[PDB]
Amino acid sequence: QFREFSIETIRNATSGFAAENIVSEHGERAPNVVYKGKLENQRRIAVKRFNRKSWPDSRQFLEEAKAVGQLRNHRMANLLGCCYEDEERLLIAEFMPNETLAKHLFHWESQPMKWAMRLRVALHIAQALEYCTSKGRALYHDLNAYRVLFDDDANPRLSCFGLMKNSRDGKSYSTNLAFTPPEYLRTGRVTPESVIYSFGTLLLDLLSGKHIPPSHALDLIRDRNIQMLMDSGLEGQFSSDDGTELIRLASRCLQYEPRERPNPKSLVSAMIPLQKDLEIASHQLLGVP
Ligand SMILES: [Cl-]
> Is residue 49 domain-shared with residue 74, that is, in the same domain?
yes
On whether 31 is known to bind a ligand per the annotation, the reply is yes
β-strand pairing of 34-38 with 44-49: antiparallel
Backbone phi and psi for residue 36, each to the nearest 5 degrees, phi listed first:
-80, 150
Rounded to the nearest whole angstrom, what is the distance from the C-alpha of residue 54 to the centroid of ligand 1?
7
If you ran DSSP here, which 8-state letter would residue 173 be given? Answer: -
Q: Are 35 and 157 within one domain?
A: no
Same domain, 68 and 102: no
Domain end point (choices 80, 96, 112):
96
The last residue of one of the domains, among 96, 111, 141, is 96
The reply to whether 85 and 170 lie within a common domain is no
3-state SS assignment for residue 75: coil
Per-residue buried b or exposed e for 157-184, using 16+ beta carbons within 10 Å of the residue's own CB: bbbbbbbbbbbeeeeeebbeeebbbebb
Domain match, 116 and 69 both: no
Q: Is 29 annotated as a binding residue?
A: yes
Count the helix, strand and coil residues of the chain and give each as a percent rounded to the nearest 5.
Answer: 45, 10, 45
The residues assigned a catalytic role are 142
Are 110 and 244 in a shared domain?
A: yes
User: Is 66:3 a contact under the CB 8 Å cutoff?
Assistant: no
117 labelled ligand-binding: no
Q: Are residues 236 and 154 in the same domain?
A: yes
- Using the mean position of ligand 1's atoms as its centre, give its distance from the Cα of residue 20 in Å: 29
Number of domains into which the chain is organized: 2
What is the distance in A from the centroid of ligand 1 to the CA of 89?
A: 10
3-state secondary structure at position 53: coil
The string of DSSP codes covering 94-130 is E--TT-BHHHHHHS-SSSPPPHHHHHHHHHHHHHHHH
In terms of domains, do 227 and 123 share one? yes
- In sequence order, what are the residues at sequence separation of 6 or more whose Cβ sits closer than 8 angstroms to the Cβ of residue 184? 190, 194
Domain enclosing residue 282, as ranges: 97-289
- On the 0-12 / 13-18 / 19+ scale of CB atoms within 10 A, 33 is buried
Q: How far is the CA of 55 from the centre of ligand 1 (A)?
A: 4
Q: What are the DSSP E strand ranges found in the chain?
A: 3-4, 34-38, 44-49, 76-77, 79-83, 90-94, 148-150, 156-159
CATH number of the domain within which 2 lies = 3.30.200.20
- Report CA(153)–ligand 1 centroid distance (Å): 36
CB atoms inside a 10 Å sphere around CB 256: 10
Question: Is 95 marked within a binding site?
Answer: yes
* Beta strand pairing call for 148-150 and 76-77: unpaired
Residues 167 and 276 in one domain: yes
Span between the terminal Cα atoms of the chain, in Å:
30
Clarify whether residues 222 and 152 are in a common domain: yes
DSSP state of 180: S
Query: Which neighbouring-strand residues pair with 47?
Result: 35, 92
Resolution, expressed in angstroms to one decimal: 1.6
Same domain for 138 and 267, yes or no, is yes
- State whether 117 and 176 are in the same domain: yes
The answer to whether 53 is a known ligand-binding residue is no
Last residue of a domain, one of 46, 66, 96: 96
Tell me how far apart the alpha carbons of residues 115 and 113 are, in angstroms, rounded to a whole number.
Answer: 7
Kindly report the CATH number assigned to the domain that includes residue 231. 1.10.510.10
Residues in the chain: 289
